[PDB]
Each structure stands twice: as C-alpha cells, then as structure tokens.
Amino acid sequence: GSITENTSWNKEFSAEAVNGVFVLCKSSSKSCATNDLARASKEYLPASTFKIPNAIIGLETGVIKNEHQVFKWDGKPRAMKQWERDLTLRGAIQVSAVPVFQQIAREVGEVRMQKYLKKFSYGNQNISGGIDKFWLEGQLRISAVNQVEFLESLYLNKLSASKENQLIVKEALVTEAAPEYLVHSKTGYSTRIEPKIGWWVGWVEKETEVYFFAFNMDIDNESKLPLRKSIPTKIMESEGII
Amino acid sequence: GSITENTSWNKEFSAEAVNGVFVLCKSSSKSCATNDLARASKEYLPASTFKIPNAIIGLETGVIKNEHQVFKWDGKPRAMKQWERDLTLRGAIQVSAVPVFQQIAREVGEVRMQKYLKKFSYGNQNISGGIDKFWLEGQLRISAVNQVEFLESLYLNKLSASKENQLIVKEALVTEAAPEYLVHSKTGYSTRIEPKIGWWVGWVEKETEVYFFAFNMDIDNESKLPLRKSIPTKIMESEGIIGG
Ligand SMILES: [Cl-]
Ligand SMILES: [Cl-]
Ligand SMILES: [Cl-]
Ligand SMILES: [Cl-]
C-alpha cells in the first residue's frame, strides 16, 4: 500500500483547536491519505476499540459461544446506565459494555490472549497491566495505521481465526445502513491514563469500493467527544463518500 | 406453529382500503399473530423477495465465489440506469438488479435450484416456468407464514447451507442499524400475474428480543406501494418495536 500526506484536511482540526489524525484508505488502489504522517504512526491505548480483537478471540477460544449469546446483567451497578441490562454480543460491542469484555478477557486468559495478539500483529502486543485492564490502563499501544491494517485483514478474512468468527464480528460492527453505503465502526475513549485519547475506526462500503479509516484525537474534556465522529464524517462527506 | 388473529389490526387495513395480511412472531415462529388467519397462509409469487434464497444458493453452489464477489457490467444496455454498473451482492439487492439474479439462477441450474428450495421448505417448491423467471411469473408461490419460518431459519443459521454463507446474506440484508436495534428486510412487487402483490418481509432485533415479520397486500397502482412499509411499521410500533 501507499500513504500520502494531505495538508488540506487540517482545516477541520484548526477550526476546532483539535490535535488529532485521520487515516483514510481506498482499497482498490491500496492508497491511503492522512493529514499528519507523524501522528498516524504514534501508538496509543486502544480503549474500547480493543472490543474488536477481543470479540474475535472470545469466539475463537469458545469463551463466547456464538452471536446469539446473551450477556445477562447480574444487577450490580455499572459505570453507565446503558450497561445495566442484558445485552447481545452486538449490543455489548455497540454500547461499549466494558464489564462484559473484562469477563471475556479473564476466561480467555494471558497465554491465549498473547498468542492471538501476536497472530494479529496488534500494536505493541504488550498485555502487561492485568488480564482484564491492559487495553484500558496497561502497556498496550496501537497506531492509526496499524488499526487500518488490522481492519483490512478482518474485512478480507485474513486474520488467524475462522471466517465464521470474522463474519460474526463484522456483522456486529455495522453502525449505519443506507441504500448507497454501509458503515462498520467502533469508538474508543482512553481516559484512565494521560494523555486522554478518543478513537473512531471502521470502514465504509460504497458502490464496489471499500474505504478503511482510523481517527484519533486528544480529548480535553467530555464536551469534545462528538468531534471524534464529526471531524472524520465531515472529511468523508467532503470526499463524496458518505 | 400456531397463528392467532389480532382483531384490532384490521383497523389499519380497512382505514386505507387495503386487502392484505401481516404476520408477526416474537422470539420464534412457534407462535405468531396476524390480522387474517386465511390470508396468512395464502401463497403468492415471491418476486424480488426470492433474492434472499437465490443469494444463499448462489453462494452455496460457488456460483457467487465469496462475500466480495463483483457482478461486472459488460456495458451492454440494461432496462434500468441503476443497473448499468458493476455491483456487489448488497448493491444488486438494493437496486433490485433482476438480471444479475437471473444469471445466478441460470448458472445454479434447475437441478440444484430445485434441491435447495426443497431443503429450505420454500413455499410450494415449484420452479416450473423457466429457470430465469419462475419466481417472477412461473408457478412458485409462498405465504407470509412460510416467509417468517424461512427467515427465522436464516436468523438461527439453521438453513441447509454453511453458516458462513448465511452470515454473508444476512449482512447484505441490513436496512437499519442502531446500538440496540437492527432491521433486516426486503421488499417485493409482483406485477406480471393478477392480482398484483406487494411484499415487505424481514426481522427486527430490539435489545435481547427478536421479531420475525411478513407483510403482503394487493397493489392497485404504484401509488399504494409505500403502504407495504407503513401499515406493518405502525403495527410493529403498536407492539413497542420502535426505530429511529
Ligand atoms: Cl475457516
Ligand atoms: Cl466509547
Ligand atoms: Cl435462460
Ligand atoms: Cl424478466
């Protein structure tokens, strides 16, 4: 593939006083563009974007039985009201139910989780910091470029997992369906350790083209969180994609 | 299965002067509700709702190579401008590209096509009338009850096809997505044999519940087509099944 720096996108960041990066890749020409090559290569806690490999590994290992599994709420208070209810696998991914995935990670265990992150070439592959929190406050780091490589492998079923399991997770990641296009995506927000990072990663299928994308930004306060989606959306709109 | 009449649903049909049926099943097809017991089991041409089994069959026979198949346009005139382009599976479904599906059916062939429709218990299972048009103007017929049974089997990966291929078709059928709400659906319009019939079939996931649905109605003219969606939408909303 190739990557090129495109300074024009900076307008959307400048207007918002945002420090951040977008990486957008057109599958047919294996060609990516970024507003910031340096930041595109910087490696940050994945936070809830880790739900993507974690769901695959959960299925691969038999910890998650299948896409019809329901994760029941035990009635104990959770950090968000939206998590205080039974959830499907898709629902637990889409509302970012950390408690559900901490449990999955515990059952997966260190030996197996390490093995998969190596197979997946996932970031620095460093799961230090406790088996249920390493993606949230441990030693794990991944870049925007690595996220797009990973998502392309998933799209093509080239990850070291069954196609069945890859498809289940693909199915779960759909976030917008229109007559002209389909969006798969996942957000993250790293807030336990400095610096505070918001992520939005995914891909768009339009006509017979596929566009993979990864976005991250420094988050000053919770009031900036929507720019996580709105800056990349604006860019993708300006490019005539969505 | 068991089918129970909900009297109150008729209001929605008589209020628009529509002859039609809606079938709705919560959790499973074991117990469904309808406005009309007789019509719920009446069988009609599937029209473009047949793209659902045909897509599964195309993948299972290897006629569609895999999820990333592109159906290439050779540049020769097609009947609609929306068809004059390369298409993905989801694209061909969205624009209702009947010529793409007809070429799939020809390559599948009558022997294989008959076998899968019988394994799937798909309507009267009659593919008489020409391999490229039996679902459009031939002898094939299916009811609203049988559509919900078929779609439930698809949802559960219980059709006689690989799980991989069932998942591929399901992704191409998503029409609405929200964190705890997901709709898979397909319209059809049968206009070659009287009476003309409109369909809307599908399923909805809401939180940890699932509902299977099938609607059909007599279509007098094109202007009544939207009802295919709004009458069943209103009834589903009456059951608390509400989208965004
Ligand atoms: Cl495999
Ligand atoms: Cl989040
Ligand atoms: Cl022919
Ligand atoms: Cl025809």
What domains lie within chain B, and their CATH numbers?
Answer: 1-243 (3.40.710.10)
- Tally the C-alpha atoms within 13 A of residue A19's C-alpha that lie toward its C-beta: 9
Task: List the alpha helices (DSSP H) in A42-87.
Answer: 51-60
* Rounded-to-integer distance, Cα A224 and Cα A204, Å: 24
Q: Are A180 and A189 in contact (CB under 8 A)?
A: no
Distances in Å between the Cα of A91 and the Cα atoms of A52, A72, A168, A198, B182 are 13, 12, 13, 20, 10
Phi first, then psi, for residue A73 (nearest 5°) are: -80, 130
> For residue A209, which of B71, B177, B88 has the smallest C-alpha distance?
B88
Reference A133, options A96, A111, A103; nearest CA is A103
Active-site pick, A48, A143, A185, A190 = A48
The strand pairing partners of B176, in sequence order, are B183
Partners of residue A205 on adjacent β-strands:
A182, A210
User: What is the side-by-side order of every strand in the sheet holding A20-26?
Assistant: A2-5, A31-34, A20-26, A209-218, A197-206, A181-190, A174-177
Give CA B123 to chain center in angstroms.
12
Among chain A residues, the shortest Cα distance to B155 is held by A68
| Two tokens, residue B41 | 């089991």
Query: Which residues have CB under 8 Å from B15's CB, separation 6+?
Result: none
Burial tier of B212 (Cβ tally within 10 Å: 0-12, 13-18, 19+): buried
Q: Within a 13 Å sphere around the CA of B79, how many CA atoms are in the beta-carbon half? A: 6
Query: Residue B125 C-alpha to ligand 3 middle, in angstroms?
Result: 19
Cα gap A205→A19, rounded to integer Å: 28
Instruction: For residue A223, indicate whether it is catalytic.
Output: no
Instruction: Report the C-alpha gap between B192 and B45 in whole angstroms.
Output: 10
Please indicate whether, in this complex, the C-beta atoms of B180 and A95 are within 8 angstroms of each other.
yes
Of A87, A91, A171, the CB nearest to B171: A171
Q: State the structure-solving technique.
A: X-ray
Annotation-wise, does B86 bind a ligand? no
**B186: closest chain A residue by CA:** A179
Contacting residues of A for B87, CB less than 8 Å apart: 208
Cβ–Cβ < 8 Å for A195, A204? no
Q: What is the Cα–Cα distance from B200 to B89, expressed in whole angstroms?
A: 19
B60-69 long-range contacts (CB < 8 A, ≥24 apart) are B60/B116, B60/B161, B60/B162, B60/B165, B61/B107, B61/B108, B61/B112, B63/B104, B63/B107, B63/B108, B64/B89, B64/B104, B66/B168, B67/A167, B67/B168, B67/B171, B68/A156
CA angle A130, A132, A133 (to 5 degrees): 70
Comparing alpha-carbon positions, the chain B residue that sits nearest to A87 is: B208
**Burial of B24: CB neighbours in 10 Å, binned 0-12, 13-18, 19+:** buried
Mutate which of B82, B170, B207 to disrupt the A interface (most A C-beta within 10 Å)? B207
Q: What is the CB neighbour count within 10 angstroms for residue A223?
A: 8
Cβ A51 vs Cβ A93: under 8 Å:
yes
CA gap A188, A51 in Å, rounded: 9
Q: How many CA atoms lie within 13 A of A197 on its CB side?
A: 29
Instruction: Tell me the C-alpha distance between A103 and A63, whole Å.
Output: 10
3-state class (DSSP) for residue B210: strand
For residue A68, the distance in angstroms to the closest alpha carbon of chain B comes to 8
> How far is the C-alpha of A148 from the C-alpha of A23, rounded, in Å?
8
Q: Where would I find the beta strands (DSSP E) of chain A? A: 2-5, 20-26, 31-34, 43-44, 70-71, 87-88, 142-143, 174-177, 181-190, 197-206, 209-218
Contact indicator for B58, B160 with CB cutoff of 8 Å: no
Residues of B in contact with A68 (CB under 8 A): 156
